[PDB]
Amino acid sequence: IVDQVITIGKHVKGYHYIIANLGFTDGDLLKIQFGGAEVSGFQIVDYDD
Amino acid sequence: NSIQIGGLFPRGADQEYSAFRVGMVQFSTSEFRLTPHIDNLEVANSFAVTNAFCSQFSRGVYAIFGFYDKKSVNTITSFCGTLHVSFITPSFPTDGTHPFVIQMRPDLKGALLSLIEYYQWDKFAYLYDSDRGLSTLQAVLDSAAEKKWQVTAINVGNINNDKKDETYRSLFQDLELKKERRVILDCERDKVNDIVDQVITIGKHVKGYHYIIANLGFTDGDLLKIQFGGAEVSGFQIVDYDDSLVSKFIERWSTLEEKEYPGAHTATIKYTSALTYDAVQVMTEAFRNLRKQRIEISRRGNAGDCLANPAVPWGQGVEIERALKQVQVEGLSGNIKFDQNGKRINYTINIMELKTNGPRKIGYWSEVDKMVLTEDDTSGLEQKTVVV
Amino acid sequence: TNAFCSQFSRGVYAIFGFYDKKSVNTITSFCGTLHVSFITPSFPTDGTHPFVIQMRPDLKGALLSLIEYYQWDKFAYLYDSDRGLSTLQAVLDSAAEKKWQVTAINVGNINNDKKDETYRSLFQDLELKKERRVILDCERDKVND
Ligand SMILES: *[C@@H]1O[C@H](CO)[C@@H](O[C@@H]2O[C@H](CO)[C@@H](O[C@@H]3O[C@H](CO)[C@@H](O)[C@H](O[C@@H]4O[C@H](CO)[C@@H](O)[C@H](O)[C@@H]4O)[C@@H]3O)[C@H](O)[C@H]2NC(C)=O)[C@H](O)[C@H]1NC(C)=O
């Protein structure tokens, strides 16, 4: 879905995407890291522990 | 019969050498066969270029077909001009007048200029490459005073692959100071793909932006990634796949085995490879005209070292050059004919506009006619005009 | 190339000479492989090149710092093609970092017969923007003209 959002260019400033799963940091986020859209998610495996 | 010809290729040339072999097979008549001596070496190092040129000269070649980079242009031109050796190259044409060189690639500066005239651009960005030659950059800089444009030229060529992601993002953040939406990329397809990837990463490929690819390899690079972004992409293509000749050539090209001929099974061919094929054709027709006019070419052996205190250039090479420049044939690049200097005259460069369906032939340009073909939609798709 | 290989066959230890826009690539690639020392007072090569000693210092930063000192925002740049486009590329790249409107004209490729006409037409074309600040990147012999 993120790849498709990138292809259509709907990941720029203004858009807001919330990932509704406990796998936020396991998947690569660098492709939308610089798009502009504010992405938010959830993580159960805190690597800082 | 067996005409020894030189074949200097870069080590990274694969589809170009494949098209050279396909052209060698297609035009190997029983009247005479062209035997090529292939030398794969580093195109950048001018010392190795000089060594290979003097090796071919010591072997006794009649016409050298090769490529060159910004370092080797002067050595090749100054060696072929003095030693009277014929040279054929699909690379970028030399700036000015240079003899004994047949540049298969046509002149694209007027094409980009006429396209800017058609789009009516007054302020845009120009990301240029240093290795591709500053000829087009000088032409647009000189036109920036005749027609008064505010162009922002950036040398993106000198970037390191380690700091690649950082330099490109900083470049586009610096280009957002003027809020630039119109960008022209004067780079090779291999680098244009990276620039497009970075534009996709930063999200500057949405509606509003306009990107012009300033090279004859528009369809060679993958355009489907920016096909649906929203930004109107436009470029230039010399190898028109809609041609019946090009279609019949691609029919055999795709069916060829990928193991023996590298990069041949594809349906799209790079413009450099097609220009290599057409150069082989032009060489064959040149030697055929030399046989038709009963002009005997012969070396008997070798005159000696290219380096000499008495400069000894063999005369018959002039006739070979004249026969090369006189040939007017039809090939993958369209109409192929050369003038007294060796540049391409009377050519057909198609202007493509990437829509949602894909690459669309929006027009074509020539040396005499600027922006002719107004085919398909003539501004009549989704307009919605309410009659009051 | 002929003179360089003649000196190499003679047995020189270090060659002191000059080069033009055409021959530079031949010299650098010949001294680099044959490990022969070269010294030249001409313009420095763009980038890093070994076995070459350029006596001339780098002037790009001097012109850039002088433009910063004079506080110029819109000017003309009449450059020479034979003298190398290094300074022109440096000022074009700085024209986005510091945002300048530079009008670069290639005055280098002009004929001595049509000299007065090409120059008068160039300055008449530069009066469209009413440019008063001009930078001349040419050799002294041409700067006098
Ligand atoms: C289809 O193709 C035809 C042949 O290729 C072409 O006819 C050519 O037309 C052009 C312009 O009309 C002619 O160009 C001139 O060439 C002569 C020398 O041959 C010169 O008068 C001049 O160039 C000179 O040579 C140098 C060029 O760099 C330069 O140093 C000189 O100062 C001077 O400029 C013109 O450029 C050309 O000769 C014609 N060819 C022939 C064989 O007669 C058709 O126009 C073309 N048609 C279409 C529709 O494309």
User: Could you tell me where the beta strands, DSSP code E, fall in C66-116?
Assistant: 74-79, 101-106
Contacts of B51 in chain C (CB under 8 A): none
Q: Does A47 touch chain B (CB under 8 A)?
A: no
Interface touch B45/C22, C-beta < 8 Å: no
Ramachandran region, residue A34 (left: φ > 0; alpha: ψ -120 to 50; beta: rest): alpha
Residue pair B75/B46 in contact by the 8 Å Cβ criterion: yes
Please indicate whether residue B337, judged by its CB atom, sits closer than 6 Å to ligand 1: yes
User: Could you tell me where the beta strands, DSSP code E, fall in C1-145?
Assistant: 14-16, 37-40, 52-54, 74-79, 101-106, 134-137
Resolution reached, in Å?
Answer: 4.7
Taking CA–CA distances from B165, the nearest residue in chain A reads A34
Taking CA–CA distances from C21, the nearest residue in chain B reads B74
Q: Does C5 touch chain B (CB under 8 A)?
A: yes
Which tokens in the block code for residue A32? 């939308």
CA B335 to ligand 1 center in whole angstroms: 14
Residue nearest to atom 45 of ligand 1 (CA): B346
Q: Does B146 touch chain C (CB under 8 A)?
A: yes
Give dist(CA B336, CA B329) in Å, integer. 6
Long-range pairs of B229-232 with CB within 8 A, sequence gap ≥ 24: B229/A7, B229/A8, B229/A9, B229/B200, B229/B205, B230/A8, B230/A9, B230/B205, B230/B206, B231/A9, B231/B204, B231/B205, B231/B206, B231/B207, B232/B353, B232/B354
Please indicate whether residue B330, judged by its CB atom, sits closer than 6 Å to ligand 1: no
Q: Does B82 touch chain C (CB under 8 A)?
A: no
Does chain A touch chain C (at least 3 C-beta pairs within 8 Å)?
A: no
Q: Does B45 touch chain C (CB under 8 A)?
A: yes
3-class DSSP string for B54-79: HHHHHHCCCEEECCCCCCCHHHHHHH
Which tokens in the block code for residue B352? 């493509």
Residue nearest to atom 25 of ligand 1 (CA): B340
Give dist(CA B24, CA B33) in Å, integer. 9
Q: Which residues of B22-34 are buried (b: 16+ CB within 10 A; e: fewer)?
A: bbbeebeeeeeeb
Please indicate whether residue B367, judged by its CB atom, sits closer than 6 Å to ligand 1: yes
Rounded to 5 degrees, φ, ψ at B13 are: -90, 115
Tally of CB atoms within 10 A around C21: 16
Taking CA–CA distances from B166, the nearest residue in chain A reads A34
Interface touch B203/A7, C-beta < 8 Å: no
Which tokens in the block code for residue B102? 């047949």
Give dist(CA B86, CA B40) in Å, integer. 19
Enumerate the H helices of chain B as residue ranges.
Answer: 15-26, 46-59, 73-83, 109-119, 135-146, 164-175, 189-202, 244-255, 271-292, 316-326
Please indicate whether residue B219, judged by its CB atom, sits closer than 6 Å to ligand 1: no
Q: Looking at chain B from residue 161 to 200, which residues have their Cβ under 8 Å from any Cβ of chain C? A: 174-175, 177-178
Tally of CB atoms within 10 A around C25: 23
CA B257 to ligand 1 center in whole angstroms: 42
Interface touch A9/B206, C-beta < 8 Å: yes
CA B339 to ligand 1 center in whole angstroms: 7
Q: Does C68 touch chain B (CB under 8 A)?
A: no
Which residue, B262, B283, B271, B272, is CA-closest to B6? Answer: B283
Q: How was this structure determined?
A: X-ray
Give dist(CA C119, CA C104) in Å, integer. 14
Please indicate whether residue B96, judged by its CB atom, sits closer than 6 Å to ligand 1: no
Q: Does C129 touch chain B (CB under 8 A)?
A: yes
Please indicate whether residue B341, judged by its CB atom, sits closer than 6 Å to ligand 1: yes
